[PDB]
Write a protein that binds this ligand. Structure first.
Ligand code: HEC
Lengths: 431, 55
């Protein structure tokens, strides 16, 4: 449970955990899809794909190393996993690919074979992964004409028109030092890694900063992707949430836990202590749903997602759910808040502490990049337990009560009523 | 008329009748609405409305 981080030339961050069996090293950049443009959208996803290409991947495999990378909105990360002993051979492969081979990975035979893969990849996504496709579109309309609206995997149109020069252009503007953090998780010590790094000098484009832009903003709107040939209806709905490093980051995350997630087929799920289940189970209004409090640097999204085959009662699904959310402003109970506290701790635990160093790396790098440090799991619990009913009520009265929303859906959505109908349910009549 | 000409039996039955008929119109208006509900309203384009309706 130690968050160690020191700066010499490069800001090095590590979180050691003795019993681990393995160790992971890599760099995480403070720039992701939210830094691209509508036309070069998909560059970051492309980088990730070449970094994992058959050529580069075969080199580290001989050495007994494994590769992993993830593209997000605010950040990007390249990671190399290894045994606790080869904690040095990872640092060689890292520098070899980001300085020496930052021109060998971009050959006219590799880039074309990779481009052909992300194209079949992103296409496959839009053709079949409906729930994620919808959540991606939710960000698209909620933050339109603003950074957060750009899909992480990029659009098929900005992708097929992307050239090697664009990769370089992006890389030379974001893969800088002042916008980077070298992460090390697994078992290796902070002082073990920091030495192998402060050994090899060379700055490589120092003093350079990435370009700036215009702040992200929420806009009440919707995008309806009707498709009557699909067998279900997938919809996502949300209000403007909380950004990371916000006084209410936790109240919000707790508020989502109150309604939580559900799966109509799993017996135990049907028994949960969520009032909403009394309303939706009578006529079986949906196969599943899940609330969330997504947070980013400039903004966030608080809402839920759901999938259903009861295409003639979608208005009741949406109506009941939004009536429950009304309660957070006027009648949420102590026991509901308490049930949430326990469950939030359990999930926040399983995330920050799993048996996989790669997840730890991403989380560590991402956090240190936005707030210059990581909040310890124990420090979180103290904040979570401190939340009162009054807090939830004040938060909801600001974020949920009579506030614009964003909607997105695909499939048999004829039954999803108009905007103003849904919008009206964000409140209740009173004397 | 109820007599030789328009007289006292006429106007009195006319009042009784004037009060009655409006309630028959009301019942007829309900049947009008029932008939309207099975296929719905038409629209200025003269074609189907089934592809885009609002509450
Ligand atoms: C001789 C014809 C006729 C008479 C008189 C008539 N209606 Fe209608 N009404 C129609 C028709 C036809 C429609 C269907 C309109 C459409 O959808 O194009 C209609 C539709 C309606 C509608 C739907 C909205 C609209 O205006 O289109 C209402 C309400 C209605 N009528 C009420 C009444 C009432 C109340 C009366 C009188 C007491 C009445 N109508 C008398 C022919 C009539």
């Amino acid at each position: 449970a130690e968050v160690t981080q020191l700066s010499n030339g490069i800001v090095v961050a590590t979180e050691h955990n003795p019993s681990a069996h393995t160790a992971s090293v890599g760099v995480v950049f403070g720039s992701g899809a939210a830094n691209e443009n509508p036309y070069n959208n998909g560059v970051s996803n492309l980088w990730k794909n070449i970094f994992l290409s058959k050529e580069n991947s075969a080199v580290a495999a001989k050495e007994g190393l494994a590769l992993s990378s993830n593209i997000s909105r605010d950040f990007q990360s390249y990671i190399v996993s290894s045994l606790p002993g080869s904690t040095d051979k990872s640092l060689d492969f890292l520098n070899q690919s980001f300085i020496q081979q930052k021109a060998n990975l971009l050959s006219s035979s590799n880039f074309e074979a990779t481009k052909k893969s992300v194209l079949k990849q992103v296409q496959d996504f839009e053709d079949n992964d409906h729930p994620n496709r919808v959540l991606e579109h939710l960000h698209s309309t909620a933050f339109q004409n603003t950074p957060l609206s750009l899909p992480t995997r990029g659009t098929l149109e900005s992708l097929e028109n992307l050239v090697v020069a664009d990769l370089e252009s992006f890389a030379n503007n974001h893969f800088l030092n002042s916008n980077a953090v070298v992460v090390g998780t697994g078992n290796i010590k902070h002082e073990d890694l920091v030495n192998s790094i402060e050994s090899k000098n060379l700055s490589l484009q120092t003093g350079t900063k990435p370009v700036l832009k215009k702040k992200a903003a929420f806009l009440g709107s919707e995008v309806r992707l009707r498709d009557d040939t699909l067998p279900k209806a997938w919809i996502s709905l949300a209000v403007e949430g909380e950004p990371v490093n916000s006084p209410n980051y936790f109240v919000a995350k707790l508020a989502a836990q109150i309604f939580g997630s559900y799966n109509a087929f799993e017996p135990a799920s049907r028994l949960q202590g969520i009032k909403l289940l009394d309303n939706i189970q009578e006529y079986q209004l949906c196969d599943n749903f899940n609330h969330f409090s997504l947070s980013y640097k400039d903004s966030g999204l608080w809402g839920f997602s759901t999938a259903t085959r009861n295409v003639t009662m979608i208005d009741d699904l949406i109506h009941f759910t939004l009536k429950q959310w009304n309660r957070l402003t006027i009648s949420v109970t102590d026991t509901e808040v308490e049930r949430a506290k326990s469950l939030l701790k359990l999930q926040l635990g399983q995330l920050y502490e799993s048996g996989n160093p790669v997840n730890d790396a991403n989380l560590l790098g991402a956090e240190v990049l936005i707030k210059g440090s990581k909040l310890s799991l124990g420090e979180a619990f103290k904040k979570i337990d401190a939340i009162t009913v009054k807090d939830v009520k004040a938060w909801a009265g600001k974020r949920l009560w009579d506030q614009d929303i964003a909607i997105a859906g695909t499939g048999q959505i004829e039954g999803l009523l108009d905007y103003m109908r849904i919008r009206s349910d964000m409140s209740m009549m009173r004397w | 008329w109820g007599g030789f000409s328009v007289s006292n039996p006429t106007i009195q039955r006319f009042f009784a009748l004037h009060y009655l008929v409006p309630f028959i119109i009301a019942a007829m208006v309900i049947m009008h609405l029932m008939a309207l509900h099975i296929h719905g309203s038409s629209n200025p384009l003269g074609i189907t409305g089934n592809l885009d309706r609002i509450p």
